[PDB]
Design a protein around this ligand. Structure first.
Ligand code: MG
Ligand code: MG
Ligand code: MG
Length: 155
RNA sequence: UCUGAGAGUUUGAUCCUGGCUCAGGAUUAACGCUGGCGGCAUGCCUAAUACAUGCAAGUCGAUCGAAAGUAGUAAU
């Protein structure tokens, strides 16, 4: 049940020897709401083929996401170009405090309660890149225990 | 035990810097349209401009002389 949702449908174009070639570009986010989510941007002369190619790319590039108590473990800032997205853990009940591309990414990934803020640009592809970078840079509290020879997150 | 949502807009199309605008609240508010009632609360932000009129700090005869009125033949 890999649900998908459309984030942006731009109308890009080039110029030829007389006239303009117009193609639709779609930014699709595919997620199973259990820990797998990817993104795919595709261009085609028509919306259906563009959506098909974007879904194919999103399913080709899937990333693994780990959740702690339905939320993100520690506060992080994802950077990608001029877009910086701040994610912050939330207690169970606040729900998704995200809006737009971040909200799409978080819901399709499976997180329940996240605090988010877009501190930079508002271009959906770069916001998605920053969000994915922030979630991917995350550290589990068992990898750090293995690294520092602590006792499975014990004090 | 706190705790933060964004979008539109420069280009044939894209990224960034960057300004403008909107989505939310609030008032000692005013205006247009309309208008049934009750519980609380507020009501010259301007001319510290000028004011008709009527009220807004008096009380004590158990401090004191006197005076007036009502009763009483008088004293009282
Ligand atoms: Mg020619
Ligand atoms: Mg234009
Ligand atoms: Mg005044």
């Amino acid at each position: 049940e890999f649900e998908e949702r459309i984030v942006k449908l731009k109308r890009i174009s080039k110029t030829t020897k007389g006239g303009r070639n117009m193609r639709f570009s779609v930014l699709v986010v595919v997620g199973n709401r259990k820990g797998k989510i990817g993104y795919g941007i595709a261009k085609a002369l028509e919306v259906p083929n563009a959506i098909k190619k974007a879904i194919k790319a999103a399913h080709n590039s899937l990333h693994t996401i780990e959740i702690h108590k339905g939320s993100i473990y520690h506060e992080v800032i994802g950077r990608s170009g001029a877009s910086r997205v701040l994610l912050k853990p939330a207690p169970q009940g606040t729900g998704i405090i995200a809006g737009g591309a971040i909200r799409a990414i978080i819901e399709l990934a499976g997180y329940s309660d996240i605090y988010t803020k877009n501190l930079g640009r508002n271009t959906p592809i770069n916001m998605i890149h920053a969000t994915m970078d922030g979630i991917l840079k995350q550290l589990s509290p068992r990898r750090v225990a293995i690294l520092r020879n602590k006792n499975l997150n014990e004090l």
